[PDB]
RNA sequence: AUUAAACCUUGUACCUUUUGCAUAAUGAACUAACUAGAAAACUUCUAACUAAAAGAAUUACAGCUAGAAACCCCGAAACCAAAC
């Protein structure tokens, strides 16, 4: 019985769907077992890494706080040294920011670099039929698994990917482009999918918010 | 000059531990939590400059506002010395 | 937003009307703005460079 | 899409691959060297609102056609932007659009123009005028953040005497207007344009059009005075005999 | 490895303790208690008779009612006056010229 | 460092420990609790509301006292 | 102390710069030397010279009668150029 | 960290000067560009 | 250049400053370290979105958001307060 997933929402109709292989963990060889529908405006979106790019600096910059100080001639008991500590934070648009996670998406899915999956529910918690599956699946040295939420990610992976260094787990708000770029492959479950194509999808329109959302 | 006759000691980085790995994990908070909690909110460091930024002036001012009532004696005449050479040169050349 | 509504007569007394049907087999596909409006804007720069810019 | 054939083709992307975009940062000049070694409040601000700019909202179906026009909606529909604090005071229109606007629907505007007001009856539209304080309105735009806050629902204030003629004035359509003379207005309207006055009455919808709240009431759905169980959906009456003397002071 | 929980905030209705030095004042007003209700309702606890004025409150606000904000009788008088004084005021421009 | 209570909270640290919290609570109510002294050479404002002329607008009313000095006689 | 490893790595480089002009190594053949090939030298020897030789003779010809002994006393612990010398 | 090397650069062509010239690297300087 | 280190031939030390000149005048025994351009209100450029834009407070009949782009050092005679 093939798992077959429709975009939820309606896909333009001068886009066709983007489709890719579902898999599941429970074997070595259970590479395929369905055949899933990726809306076309989140995973066949224009490549532009500039985006990603720019996205990739503000992410590691606006965390940036410098704590080197130097004392004045009038300080002494540096004409031109540090002084105190100096924040770099900075916000950028949300839209961009939305639509640098799209590109992240179409890169590491038209490179055969994101593996679709049903569940992360594995046979066993050892981590190494974890690592080996990778090596049978020709995964990356790093491969990065993304679950809906942080409460129910099944206890066996957790126990394998906890215990891995280049294999990361992380719940589906965690998702970020850094990890997807410095992770090698990049595996997601059908129900995450799902999760965020809605938030970017729901982007569409502005209605501007007269306040915070908090 | 003279310069050193030995090599300094080696030194190795892990470049996947799990703070250069999971670093950044939850800058979309916003967009994947609903905007409940503004990324601004993950800022940490010292309190007048979470989630705000500004010049060495505006820095230091609201420093001198946020702590002090629980500023030093010493270290607040020191600041408010201070301030007033920075406030001649920005405010008046 | 909501999608326009579906009118019995086109153009709408406004002057709107939805991207005709068929669309062209052209090979230069051109999409309406979230507004289901034409993406041609005017722009001048340099205050006396008149532009107009499809994106 | 040949884009798309270039990206299959092309390797694994990494970290150090990022590059800046052309362009995107300039050069910056630093003295490490010789190069930079040596050297009115009163009057209310009215907004308006475009007849063709009506239209098209209309035609959007951006505000709903069987309910009345309502500030709030055009709020909630983002119509217009206002901002407390510009203190925005006044809603108008735009004379422009009066032959690209062809509709009618109940509506009721802080100002409405004399010639507009015939042309939309003249259509069948229904236009009267009411007064909203400024503070009151800014509250009536943003009803959940007072109910936050627990304030209730008060009583809708009055204009200054300054603006008391206008609301008063018959032709002005507004609340304040003597409804006697609304008949009498509404046929020298008719006779001015010349066009056959159609009956409010006949409409089908009448109640639903000719519906107006009291000068002191804020909300047609709730009365000034009242309570909404924010929590609970619902709304809260209240029942004490001084809250009425209160509302009646 | 496995990233840590999500960051949440916690919901629900928190009330700071008056005693306590560092809390500051703002948050131990009525507004504040008022503003509970607001958030969660009857989850809060707030009595909603509270929320009315109370009767000394009633009486002030009566006051300033009939102090400052005239009634529709009082504002028509006016106008007449008004009318009265620019009737005398036109006769007396044309008298004049 | 910084001090985490303001060195105003300092007095009232020292009252909630040592001799201070002993003290007689009547004793300490009466310290504790401070009372305006009748007002002489000003007039408080009868009104919490006025209506500013300039603007005809309603504004809550604050009231200033003049300064004034007792000497120790 | 001047900080960094580049710089301590570029001293070290100068440092044994002045020690080879000081010390010079005793000089050594090339087929000591790493990356030699005999066969490919012969090879290309002979299509540097465009002569033709008989590689089984022509190694016979470099074979010495001193070299024979060291492997022979390499082996204690193969034809003269004699011949060919004659002619 | 490479100043050494600035200074060699200069020295290479002064080292067959005479005097405090070929020693001092004011001086040096100045006659490696006249006799260039 | 040269067979040849010197001879023959050619050539009025350096920085600063005076006129775009010094046979003026200042400063330098030499070695090593240290020793002097710092801010964004607006514009151009790079992008997001568009009669809208911005994660609250702003501007708007193509605007609006983000990013990048900038303005030294040492040295007086003095003046005042509080101690000694």
Request: net charge positive.
């Amino acid at each position: 019985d093939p798992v077959l997933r429709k975009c939820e929402l309606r896909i333009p109709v001068h886009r066709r769907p983007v489709q890719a292989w579902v898999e599941s963990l429970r074997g070595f060889e259970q590479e395929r077992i369905g055949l899933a529908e990726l809306h076309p405006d989140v995973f066949a979106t224009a490549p532009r890494l500039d985006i990603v790019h720019q996205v990739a600096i503000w992410q590691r910059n606006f965390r940036r706080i410098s704590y080197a100080n130097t004392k004045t001639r009038a300080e002494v008991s540096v004409a031109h040294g540090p002084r105190g500590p100096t924040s770099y934070y900075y916000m950028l648009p949300m839209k961009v920011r939305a639509l640098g996670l799209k590109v992240a998406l179409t890169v590491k899915l038209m490179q055969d670099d994101l593996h679709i999956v049903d569940s992360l529910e594995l046979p066993t918690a050892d981590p190494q039929y974890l690592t080996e599956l990778a090596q049978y699946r020709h995964w990356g040295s790093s491969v990065l698994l993304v679950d809906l939420t942080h409460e129910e990610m099944p206890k066996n992976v957790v126990a394998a990917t906890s215990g891995l260094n280049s294999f990361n787990l992380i719940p589906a708000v965690g998702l970020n482009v850094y990890s997807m770029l410095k992770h090698q492959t990049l595996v997601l479950t059908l129900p995450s999918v799902a999760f965020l194509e809605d938030k970017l999808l729901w982007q569409d329109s502005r209605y501007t918010p007269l306040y915070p959302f908090r | 000059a003279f310069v050193r006759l030995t090599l300094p000691p080696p030194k190795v980085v892990d470049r996947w531990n799990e703070k250069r790995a999971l670093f950044g994990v939850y800058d979309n908070i916003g967009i994947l939590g609903n905007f409940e909690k503004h990324p601004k909110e993950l800022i940490k460091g010292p309190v007048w400059l979470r989630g705000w930024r500004g010049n060495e002036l505006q820095r230091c001012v609201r420093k001198k506002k946020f702590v002090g009532n629980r500023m030093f004696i010493e270290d607040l005449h020191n600041l408010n010395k201070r301030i007033s050479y920075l406030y001649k040169h920005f405010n008046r050349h | 937003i909501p999608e326009p509504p579906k009118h019995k007569h086109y153009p709408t007394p406004s002057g709107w009307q939805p991207p005709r049907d068929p669309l062209p087999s052209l090979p230069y596909f051109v999409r309406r703005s979230r507004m289901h409006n034409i993406p041609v804007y005017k722009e001048i720069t340099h205050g006396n460079r008149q532009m107009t810019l499809i994106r | 899409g040949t884009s798309l054939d270039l990206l299959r083709s092309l390797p694994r992307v990494s970290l150090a691959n990022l590059k800046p975009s052309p362009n995107s940062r300039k050069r910056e000049r630093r003295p490490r060297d010789r190069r930079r070694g040596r050297k009115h409040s009163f009057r209310h601000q009215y907004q308006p609102l475009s007849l063709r700019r009506l239209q098209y909202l209309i035609d959007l179906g951006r505000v709903d056609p069987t309910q009345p026009i309502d500030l709030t909606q055009l709020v909630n529909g983002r119509g217009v932007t206002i901002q407390p604090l510009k203190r925005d005071y006044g809603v108008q229109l735009v004379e422009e659009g009066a032959d690209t606007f062809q509709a009618k629907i109940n509506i009721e505007v802080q100002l409405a123009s004399e010639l507009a007001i015939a042309a939309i009856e003249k259509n069948g539209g229904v236009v009267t005028t009411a007064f909203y304080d400024p503070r009151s309105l800014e509250i009536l735009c943003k009803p959940i953040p007072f109910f936050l806050r627990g304030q209730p629902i008060p009583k809708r204030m009055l204009p200054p005497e300054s603006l008391v003629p206008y609301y008063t004035d018959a032709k002005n359509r507004g609340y304040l207007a003597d409804p006697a003379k609304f008949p009498e207005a509404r046929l020298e309207l008719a006779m001015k344009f010349g066009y056959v006055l159609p009956d409010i009455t006949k409409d089908e919808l009448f109640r639903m059009l000719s519906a107006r709240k009291d000068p002191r009431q804020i909300f047609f759905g709730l009365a000034p005075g009242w309570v909404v169980n924010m929590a609970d959906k619902k709304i809260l009456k209240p029942t004490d005999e001084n809250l009425l003397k209160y509302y009646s002071s | 490895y496995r990233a840590p929980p999500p960051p949440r905030r916690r919901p629900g209705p928190h009330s700071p303790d008056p005693e306590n030095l560092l809390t500051p004042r703002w948050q131990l007003t009525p507004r504040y208690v008022a503003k509970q209700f607001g958030r969660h309702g009857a989850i809060s606890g707030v009595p909603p008779a509270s929320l009315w004025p109370t009767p000394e409150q009633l009486r002030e606000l009566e006051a300033e009612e009939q102090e400052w904000y005239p009634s529709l009788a009082t504002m028509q008088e006016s106008l007449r006056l008004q009318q009265q004084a620019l009737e005398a005021r036109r006769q007396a421009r044309e008298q004049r010229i | 460092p910084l001090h985490r209570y303001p060195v105003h909270l300092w007095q009232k640290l020292r009252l909630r420990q040592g001799i201070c919290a002993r003290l007689p609570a009547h004793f300490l109510r009466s310290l504790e609790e401070e009372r305006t002294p009748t007002p002489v050479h000003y007039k408080p404002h009868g009104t919490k509301f006025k209506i500013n002329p300039k603007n005809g607008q309603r504004e809550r009313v604050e009231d200033v006292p003049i300064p004034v000095h007792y000497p120790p006689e | 102390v001047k900080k960094g490893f580049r710089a301590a790595f570029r001293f070290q480089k100068e440092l044994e710069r002045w020690r080879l002009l000081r010390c010079p190594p005793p000089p050594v053949r090339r087929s000591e030397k790493p990356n030699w090939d005999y066969h490919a030298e012969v090879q290309a020897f002979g299509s540097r010279l465009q002569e033709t030789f008989s590689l089984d003779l022509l190694k016979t010809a470099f074979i010495n009668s001193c070299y024979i002994k060291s492997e022979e006393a390499k082996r204690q612990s193969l034809k003269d150029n004699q011949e060919l010398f004659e002619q | 960290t490479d100043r050494y090397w600035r200074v060699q650069e200069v020295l290479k062509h002064a080292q067959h000067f005479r005097g405090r010239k070929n020693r001092c690297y004011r001086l040096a300087v100045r006659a490696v560009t006249r006799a260039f």
